[PDB]
RNA sequence: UGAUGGAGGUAGAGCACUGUUUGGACUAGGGGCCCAUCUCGGGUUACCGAAUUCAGAUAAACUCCGAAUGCCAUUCAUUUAUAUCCGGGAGUCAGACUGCGAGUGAUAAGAUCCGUAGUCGAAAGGGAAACAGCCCAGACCACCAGCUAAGGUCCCAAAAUA
RNA sequence: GCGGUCGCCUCCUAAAAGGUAACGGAGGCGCCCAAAGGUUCCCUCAGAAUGGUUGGAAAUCAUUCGAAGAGUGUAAAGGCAGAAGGGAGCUUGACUGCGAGACCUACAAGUCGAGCAGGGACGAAAGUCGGGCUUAGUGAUCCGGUGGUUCCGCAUGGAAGGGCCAUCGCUCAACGGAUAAAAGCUACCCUGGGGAUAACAGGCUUAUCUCCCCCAAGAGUCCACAUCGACGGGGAGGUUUGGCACCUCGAUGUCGGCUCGUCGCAUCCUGGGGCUGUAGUCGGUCCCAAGGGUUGGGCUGUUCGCCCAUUAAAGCGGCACGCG
RNA sequence: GUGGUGGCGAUAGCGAGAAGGAUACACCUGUUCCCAUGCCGAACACAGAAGUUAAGCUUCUUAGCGCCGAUUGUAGUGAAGGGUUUCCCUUUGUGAGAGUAGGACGUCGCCACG
């Protein structure tokens with residue numbers, strides 16, 4: 057099923073790939089909720105920035 | 114100790130992270146001197162330790178030096194500004210990683226071996242210890 | 248000794264080709280069968 | 296002295312596997328045939344590989360331990 | 370970002386080539402000593418020892434091998450929205466530090482030179498006592514409202530003498 | 532500043548695409564070949580062992596072993612034994628006009644190129660051939676020279692003189708080349724700028740310097756450790772010689788001495804103590820101790836240093852080598 | 856069954872050993888001619904069919920050599936951190952080389968003849 061995503065750690069000092077994962081998911085300011093499907097692409101992005109993010113089923 | 118011929122006079126200092134490929138267990142002798150830290154070791158150190166071990170052994174037994182100074186190392190004369198090339202080779206050196214055995218000994222009782230290796234350890238810069246073969 | 252050389256069509260007296268040669272190894276005046284685009288045939292081109 | 300070197304020449308692959316490409320293109324510059332030519336591919340004076348017709352680039356092992364380039368059109 | 374397929378010989382590892390190298394068996398060959406001397410054939414210091422072989426090592430300019438990453442591409446997928454071309458206008462060509470990868474260096478320098486990422490520069494704010502460059506974090510404004518980050522909770526000085 | 536370098540090629544550095552710097556490490560080029568090219572056909576090397584005459588360690592012959600350990604014109608890298616290596620025939624494609632499209636690229640340039648047309652080489656034919664095994668063997672424009680041209684020709688015809696095409700002349704090597712043509716002194720110097728750039732002092736570092744310590748072979752009649760202490764190793768300090776050029780060039784005053792001192796202790800004397808190869812006096816060494824004291828002259832601008840003569844003693848350093 | 860001819864990373868190979876020639880392939884007998892050997896009819900080429908398959912060539916055995924090759928585990932390493940920061944450690948993920956277990960003395964086809 058879909059997953060909720062929230063930034064919990066800033067994009068400052070973090071590389072462009074992580075910053076672009078955030079822009080692509082569609083998140084801006086921290087503590088920003090977004091909802092996505094459980095695709096392998098988005099799970100890979102979440103594994104790319106797991107330290108930056110909290111998630112929910 | 115010196116290498117009699119070399120393909121390139123000057124070399125890189127290199128790096129020393131990680132344990133040693135080989136020389137990691139005692140092979141020819143009964144006891145040996147294991148390095149617990151990685152460091153450069155020179156001609157003078159090797160020869161001093163060898164002479165120490167031999168004298169305390171009273172030319173008994175046999176000693177084996179596993180390392181060899183393949184690498185060189187340069188320096189600039191005091192008063193020389195940086196640049197204008199690379200310095201002249203001062204001496205010769207062996208990069209000895211941790212886990213390496215440097216000296217092996219056999220043909221000599223155990224206490225004599227331990228004490229000779231103790232002496233050589235005090236002569237070397239590395240923090241060392243004793244190893245025995247099965 | 249080794250010299251850069253203009254060949255020449257013996258008929259048209261047109262140079263048409265640039266090449267190289269020794270004088271030691273190739274002292275005699277070099278010759279070839281080369282194309283003269285002014286005649287649109289093949290012709291004896293002789294060094295000059 | 297030692298302080299000199301030449302212009303680095305931009306060897307290696309230039310077209311990728313699974314990539315459609317024009318004819319006359321260039322696929323792999325090289326000095327010496329570190330990869331051989333194959334189907335619909337030529338080779339220049341400087342051992343450079345070029346596709347003679349359109350198609351997708353495909354690199355293949357030429358048996359055990361030599362490589363090949365091929366261009367299968369559509 | 371995922372999946373797929375490729376190029377590539379790096380860290381690592383290894384000795385299969387190129388070099389360096391330890392010990393041992395054997396030894397061409399090279400030393401003397403003596404007998405024999407036309408100086409001709411030996412016999413030994415467990416004399417020095419090519420070469421072969423056993424075992425052990427070693428490498429930026431060695432590789433039988435060989436990653437993680439990164440790179441190129443897919444009328445492939447997902448999510449976002451910036452890429453291209455034309456033309457106007459610029460400024461910038463003194464860069465600094467921190468972390469990782471290398472060189473020079475004395476594997477010293479807040480040293481020098483590159484790569485890579487970040488920050489400063491051009492960025493306030495909170496912590497590091499103070500402290501461009503470190504850690505957290507991006508000031509549109511107001512609020513005598515709240516939840517947290519790093520960092521902290523005996524007093525200075527808010528929070529546990531938990 | 533000298534040295535070295537400036538253009539081009541190869542490797543490493545270069546961090547498994549490409550690219551990537553240094554006064555970083557190593558080497559080369561400024562050509563050669565008329566066959567060292569093309570094609571057709573054929574062949575496969577190096578070394579070792581064995582044997583054999585001069586003939587040896589080793590020429591040449593023969594067999595076997597032999598996967599490349601050879602050779603590839605020339606550097607290194609890559610690659611090549613289906614050959615690019617080697618040999619023999621026939622030739623000259625080391626052709627002309629071109630060239631889709633790609634690579635690299637700031638620009639100028641550079642690289643590869645199927646394919647078309649003409650006219651050919653080789654080969655029975657397929658088919659290969661627009662130089663070599665791949666990458667260096669090179670340089671603008673201007674200016675002149677040579678040959679050709681169906682181009683132009685100051686009113687006309689010509690001519691002079693220009694253009695187009697082919698090509699020659701540049702270690703213009705400081706190799707994107709200032710001019711066709713060019714060395715020096717300045718302490719008589721002046722301007723404009725700079726801590727972007729030298730330096731004292733300062734700072735970072737501490738190779739070096741000083742001091743301290745570890746191992747302990749040995750010397751010490753014997754006895755390693757009273758006292759010394761080889762070869763070797765490890766640290767502290769920030770007084771030495773250095774390195775870096777961060778501050779200071781819209782001022783930075785340069786050494787020594789004088790006057791005044793102040794601080795540290797790695798203590799020169801005095802004070803305390805242990806060990807002694809300390810009989811006693813003198814001492815040697817080490818630990819504690821910085822309270823006070825720690826000279827006057829000759830020589831030199833001198834610090835230092837030597838000397839004279841005393842002293843209980845004639846300390847070592849820092850404070851912008853203290854203080855203009 | 857033999858011969859020819861192709862593809863698959865030699866898992867195909869190299870060595871050793873056994874047998875066979877029915878056709879076949881081969882050796883083999885020669886130089887008459889096309890043609891050839893920096894010398895040679897050895898090789899090339901041509902013609903033939905007395906003899907033997909001894910060899911080569913086929914089929915079988917062999918794990919000696921070489922080739923392939925796991926699993927586990929490790930090193931290394933991307934990302935995120937920590938430390939006492941020329942280095943070391945932790946979480947997660949990937950993951951060699953070596954050393955092996957083991958495989959492997961071939962697989963797939965086409966054609967001619969028997």
Ligand SMILES: [K+]
Pocket residue numbers: 234235236237238239240241
């Ligand atoms: K030590």
Ligand SMILES: [K+]
Pocket residue numbers: none
């Ligand atoms: K920024």
Ligand SMILES: [K+]
Pocket residue numbers: none
């Ligand atoms: K500055």
Ligand SMILES: [K+]
Pocket residue numbers: 779780782783
């Ligand atoms: K100044």
Ligand SMILES: [K+]
Pocket residue numbers: none
């Ligand atoms: K003053």
Ligand SMILES: [Mg+2]
Pocket residue numbers: 340341
């Ligand atoms: Mg060429």
Ligand SMILES: [Mg+2]
Pocket residue numbers: none
């Ligand atoms: Mg390595």
Ligand SMILES: [Mg+2]
Pocket residue numbers: 468
């Ligand atoms: Mg870090």
Ligand SMILES: [Mg+2]
Pocket residue numbers: none
């Ligand atoms: Mg700096």
Ligand SMILES: [Mg+2]
Pocket residue numbers: none
């Ligand atoms: Mg950096």
Ligand SMILES: [Mg+2]
Pocket residue numbers: none
């Ligand atoms: Mg600015």
Ligand SMILES: [Mg+2]
Pocket residue numbers: none
């Ligand atoms: Mg700030």
Ligand SMILES: [Mg+2]
Pocket residue numbers: none
């Ligand atoms: Mg400011």
Ligand SMILES: [Mg+2]
Pocket residue numbers: none
């Ligand atoms: Mg709260």
Ligand SMILES: [Mg+2]
Pocket residue numbers: 527
């Ligand atoms: Mg409080």
Ligand SMILES: [Mg+2]
Pocket residue numbers: none
């Ligand atoms: Mg690269």
